[PDB]
RNA sequence: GAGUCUGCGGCGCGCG
């Protein structure tokens, strides 16, 4: 095509790693970068489904407010740091994956110490789980699920093992979004919009993947205007 | 704004409009560059903020900052008290829990 | 929403009489000399520049970034050419809306302050 | 029990501003800075 | 379908005439009514293409602030009344149409007094242009164009005739939009969004038609994210 | 086809 349709939003991408990814799109008519950028932003933060630690089970621990010998951190501080764990599974077949880890003695327990699982990957390896002294026995099973939004540990209440303790759900693989609308020049009229939105991701998913999912959630919603009543 | 300059982008249409309404206000000396004006405005303790619900800016600079805020103790006075029926005093026959 | 703004008068404020006062202070405005809200008795160039037929016409221009709500413009109401800011016109509506009897709504409201 | 800050609770700064939480807004639409960094609490100016 | 998809936005319509039309749609997840309502609003006002008086030429008048004898109204009041004129052309071939009208003597000048044009129609006949007394000579040429949004008479500055005077452009057929997001209750979770947007139209197009055009301009824009670069 | 018995006076502090 040549005139108005060839003159189409040039989608340009710049993504480093699976965390950052800038997305530029121009030219746009009057005040459209804002009309597109804000919605997508509201989607990217709420809608995008993800992963979060749903439950944990220390072998000798019964409640959430206990302390394990040979381990500096307390069960609460540990379960906290687990919320920080960002895992990334590759397909729907993995709805609920239980990561297993057991370490003993004078060693630091990092997230890469979890025995690897076939379809699951951990992009948060060096995350500090705990500091083991001597005679430090830590054997736990940490549940992981795919969901959306925030789910209080009280709302779901998972119970794989009777003495396990649920943990608060943090399901947005996106930490922050940002979009700017700077003027762009098209030969004839100077009043134009250029929308560039920057997206940051925990690693679970990629900025590009997220954007695609976002636009989809928006389009699916634009179809819900079909049957009058 | 320094990292913003290098990260690759300048000022918004949003950031510029609030500036107009800001100089019409008397928060920034008229005639200086938006880069220089936002600084003056920033020194005033307020920056530009977008609604979040609309994406549009909030006409006029709004101050923002790190404020230390504590949570007050939740007494059994907070944890509400609603009564249907219940005990009664032994000598006076008025309700008591 | 309902307050009008005032800004700068350095050069002539007398459009009340000359037609050369309309053109010159309209160009001087486009320039940097005369503001959209200048102490110019009858009409500061801000009213000279914009005239809104229907009520709605006034607010559309606002959303598009042509006029602030607190700016002094001219608008055509039911039977009068009223020189009242967008906001003041918007307030009029909100009231007129709350209670459908619109005429009975302007009868008891003052959009002059 | 874990008391997650809820609407019923009250908070205040060392100066004297006291108040209770009226609404837990979703990060989705509350006032956000040029850069994606969103504000956590929004205080009413009139009380100052 | 039955569970999550049948639980779909029930599009409900209530339209009286071609001017007003309320549109309710629920249920919606968290903060979606806002995400959909605002964009559609920004579109409905600027995007929907239309027709507005772009310029006018009274034959004996030179400037915008003059008064014509035998004519009560002043040039300013008249050019104002013209903004109120709503015309409707039928095909792209009509980009700029100049409507001609000349009336004399003790007659009222209404919009139906304009000499008819082949592919153009006037849905605002009874609109009052002016009141002619005696020896009332009014001969004018009023330009009409197809555009979008609002364009100050200062921004375009049309000049068919040297003494003609430009008029502010009022292109959209929708005067005002409005959307509310009130909570709705779905058995299980109370936190829900209900979006109802009220649209007002001059008559040229209908609220429903407008909405449809709007969601399309949005979808077409969501596709512009296709080819990376 | 359910109902007894306890929690009072005072003191201190804290909220609106």
């Amino acid at each position: 095509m040549l005139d108005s349709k060839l003159k189409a939003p040039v989608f340009t991408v710049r993504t480093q790693g699976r965390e950052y990814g800038e997305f530029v799109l121009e030219p746009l008519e009057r005040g459209f970068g804002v009309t597109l950028g804000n919605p997508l932003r509201r989607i990217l933060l709420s809608s995008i489904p993800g992963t979060a630690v749903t439950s944990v089970y220390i072998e000798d621990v019964l409640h959430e407010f206990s302390t394990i010998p040979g381990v500096k951190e307390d069960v609460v501080e540990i379960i906290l740091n687990l919320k920080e764990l960002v895992v990334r599974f590759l397909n729907p077949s993995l709805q609920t994956v239980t990561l297993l880890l057991k370490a003993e003695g004078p060693k630091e327990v990092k997230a890469r110490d979890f025995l690897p699982v076939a379809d699951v990957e951990i992009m948060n390896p060096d995350l500090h789980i705990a500091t083991l002294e001597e005679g430090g026995r830590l054997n736990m099973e940490v549940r992981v699920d795919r969901g959306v939004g925030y789910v209080p540990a009280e709302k779901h209440g998972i119970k794989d093992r009777i003495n396990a303790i649920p943990v608060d759900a943090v399901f947005s693989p996106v930490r922050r979004v940002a979009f700017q609308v700077e003027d762009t020049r098209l030969g004839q009229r100077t009043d134009l919009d250029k929308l560039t939105l920057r997206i940051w991701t925990d690693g679970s998913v990629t900025p590009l993947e997220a954007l695609n999912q976002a636009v989809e959630i928006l389009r699916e919603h634009l179809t819900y205007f079909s049957n009058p009543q | 704004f320094g990292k913003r300059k290098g990260e690759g982008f300048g000022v918004d249409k949003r950031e510029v409009e609030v500036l107009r309404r800001a100089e019409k206000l008397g928060l920034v000396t008229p005639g200086k560059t938006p880069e220089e004006q936002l600084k003056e405005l920033f020194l005033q303790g307020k920056v530009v903020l977008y609604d979040g619900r609309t994406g549009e800016p909030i006409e006029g600079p709004i101050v923002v900052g790190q404020m230390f805020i504590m949570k007050l103790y939740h007494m059994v006075e907070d944890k509400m008290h609603a009564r249907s029926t219940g005990p009664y005093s032994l000598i006076t026959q008025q309700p008591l829990g | 929403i309902t307050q009008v703004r005032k800004e700068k008068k350095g050069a002539g404020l007398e459009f009340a009489t000359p037609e050369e006062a309309l053109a010159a202070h309209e160009r001087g405005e486009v320039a940097l000399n005369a503001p959209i809200k200048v102490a110019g008795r009858e009409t500061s160039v801000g009213r000279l520049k914009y005239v809104f037929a229907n009520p709605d016409e006034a607010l559309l221009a606002v959303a598009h970034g042509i006029v602030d709500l607190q700016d002094v413009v001219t608008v055509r109401y039911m039977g009068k050419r009223l020189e009242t800011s967008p906001g003041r016109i918007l307030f009029a509506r909100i009231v007129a809306e709350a209670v459908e009897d619109e005429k009975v709504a302007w009868e008891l409201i003052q959009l002059d302050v | 029990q874990k008391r997650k800050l809820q609407v019923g609770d009250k908070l205040a700064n060392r100066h004297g501003n006291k108040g209770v939480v009226a609404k837990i807004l979703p990060v989705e639409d509350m006032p956000h800075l040029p850069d994606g960094t969103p504000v956590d609490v929004i205080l009413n100016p009139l009380g100052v």
Side-chain angles (χ1 to χ4, degrees), chain A, chain B, chain C, chain D:
Chain A
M1 312 74 63
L2 338 163
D3 224 66
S4 223
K5 249 115 280 180
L6 180 97
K7 186 212 224 195
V10 169
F11 177 50
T12 147
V13 187
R14 327 157 273 174
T15 182
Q16 195 261 318
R18 346 201 53 200
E19 284 128 278
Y20 202 8
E22 263 143 40
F23 310 109
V24 180
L25 185 105
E26 123 280 338
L28 319 155
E29 235 315 293
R30 177 125 205 62
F32 277 143
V34 159
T35 269
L36 284 177
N38 184 216
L40 302 180
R41 182 251 177 58
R42 281 189 69 137
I43 297 280
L44 285 162
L45 278 78
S46 73
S47 338
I48 306 182
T51 56
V53 187
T54 305
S55 182
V56 185
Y57 181 49
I58 296 290
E59 289 266 356
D60 233 341
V61 174
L62 7 56
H63 63 289
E64 206 213 301
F65 321 77
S66 338
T67 146
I68 301 176
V71 199
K72 196 261 276 177
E73 10 263 81
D74 70 61
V75 179
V76 172
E77 298 176 300
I78 304 176
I79 55 87
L80 171 155
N81 291 142
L82 252 204
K83 320 171 178 193
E84 239 79 327
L85 153 56
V86 47
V87 265
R88 157 199 263 275
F89 350 102
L90 289 86
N91 192 59
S93 294
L94 235 62
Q95 272 157 28
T96 175
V97 219
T98 301
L99 264 64
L100 206 144
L101 189 173
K102 80 225 173 206
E104 290 241 0
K107 184 182 175 73
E108 254 178 354
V109 172
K110 314 288 191 129
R112 58 198 64 169
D113 286 62
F114 282 108
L115 41 109
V117 192
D119 300 347
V120 82
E121 93 165 69
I122 295 174
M123 289 79 62
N124 214 35
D126 244 304
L127 147 55
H128 183 139
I129 276 294
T131 66
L132 240 53
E133 157 213 282
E134 296 279 356
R137 312 187 219 68
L138 89 80
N139 188 37
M140 63 168 100
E141 44 264 81
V142 312
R143 192 133 108 64
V144 180
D145 264 50
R146 163 188 200 179
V148 199
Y150 154 74
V151 174
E154 314 78 54
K155 177 71 280 173
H156 44 198
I158 294 314
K159 271 310 180 76
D160 307 281
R161 236 145 294 83
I162 50 149
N163 298 188
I165 63 105
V167 182
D168 302 288
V170 281
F171 285 118
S172 165
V174 196
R175 174 39 216 290
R176 60 166 188 189
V177 179
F179 73 82
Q180 295 259 151
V181 181
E182 41 178 354
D183 246 297
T184 162
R185 63 114 205 200
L186 280 40
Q188 50 172 183
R189 203 65 164 170
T190 342
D191 83 323
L192 293 152
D193 301 52
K194 196 151 180 182
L195 178 61
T196 75
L197 97 161
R198 330 145 58 176
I199 299 166
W200 288 274
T201 318
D202 59 348
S204 176
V205 292
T206 207
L208 215 94
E209 287 168 303
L211 168 68
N212 292 44
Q213 303 202 52
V215 175
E216 297 326 85
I217 300 157
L218 201 53
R219 293 191 54 216
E220 283 190 356
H221 293 1
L222 264 63
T223 189
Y224 285 127
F225 300 81
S226 185
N227 62 173
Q229 188 145 172
Chain B
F1 193 60
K3 199 180 176 64
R4 272 263 311 294
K5 309 147 65 177
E7 282 169 294
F9 329 99
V11 283
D12 279 87
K13 236 101 69 185
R14 325 309 137 193
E15 289 230 7
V16 169
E17 227 196 305
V18 62
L19 286 167
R20 175 165 300 176
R21 290 241 190 171
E23 54 86 37
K24 294 205 180 192
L25 224 330
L27 303 349
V28 260
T29 36
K32 282 217 274 188
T33 147
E35 182 148 331
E36 275 289 338
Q37 252 205 23
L38 212 196
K39 180 126 216 162
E40 167 116 55
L41 197 48
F42 197 108
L43 309 168
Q44 274 219 181
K46 41 185 162 298
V47 307
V48 187
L49 217 56
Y50 311 66
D51 279 341
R53 11 156 310 204
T54 180
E56 273 5 295
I58 307 180
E59 318 163 300
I62 292 176
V63 317
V64 291
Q66 298 180 317
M67 201 179 248
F68 186 61
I69 292 152
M70 18 235 280
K71 202 274 292 172
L72 286 174
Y73 168 45
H74 254 3
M75 224 118 185
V76 191
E77 91 168 303
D78 103 272
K79 276 296 161 160
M80 50 244 226
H81 253 49
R83 187 248 239 232
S84 173
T85 335
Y88 282 82
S89 152
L90 186 44
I91 71 299
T92 143
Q93 275 331 64
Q94 314 227 328
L96 281 177
Chain C
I1 142 203
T2 76
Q3 178 59 295
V4 187
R5 312 179 303 197
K6 307 140 202 172
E7 179 186 293
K8 172 228 165 172
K9 170 173 61 185
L13 80 115
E14 339 185 315
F15 169 52
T17 301
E19 50 172 283
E20 206 103 45
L22 94 84
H25 306 331
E26 165 155 53
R27 311 146 193 259
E29 153 277 307
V30 183
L32 274 180
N33 195 173
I36 300 178
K37 36 201 162 292
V38 189
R41 191 33 48 196
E42 276 41 271
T43 63
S44 327
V45 66
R47 308 174 184 178
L48 213 74
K49 281 209 68 183
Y50 304 145
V51 296
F52 313 143
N54 201 51
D56 290 85
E57 296 237 334
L59 317 98
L60 335 177
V62 186
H64 292 43
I66 307 299
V67 287
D68 306 282
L69 309 125
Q70 317 71 42
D71 264 356
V72 240
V73 209
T74 37
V75 175
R76 178 286 296 159
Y77 183 65
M78 286 180 94
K80 216 161 192 167
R81 351 200 187 193
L82 268 162
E83 302 197 57
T84 310
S85 304
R88 337 240 286 179
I89 214 295
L90 182 43
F91 174 56
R93 193 212 252 172
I94 314 165
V95 188
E97 199 113 21
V99 183
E100 155 62 48
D101 193 313
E102 193 217 53
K103 289 278 196 160
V104 171
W106 93 267
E107 281 169 353
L108 40 72
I109 65 97
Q110 44 202 290
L111 49 67
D112 267 17
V113 279
Chain D
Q1 65 177 96
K2 286 217 300 183
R3 308 245 156 196
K4 282 231 159 182
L5 177 61
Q6 51 159 152
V7 56
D9 289 67
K10 45 175 179 176
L11 41 157
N13 69 194
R14 280 171 279 174
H15 289 295
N17 244 303
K18 187 158 172 182
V20 178
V21 159
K23 173 155 274 180
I24 16 73
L25 245 72
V27 60
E28 294 146 53
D29 53 10
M30 104 146 40
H32 51 166
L33 181 157
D35 167 36
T37 73
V39 292
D40 301 68
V41 59
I42 305 157
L43 269 180
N44 190 24
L46 289 146
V48 188

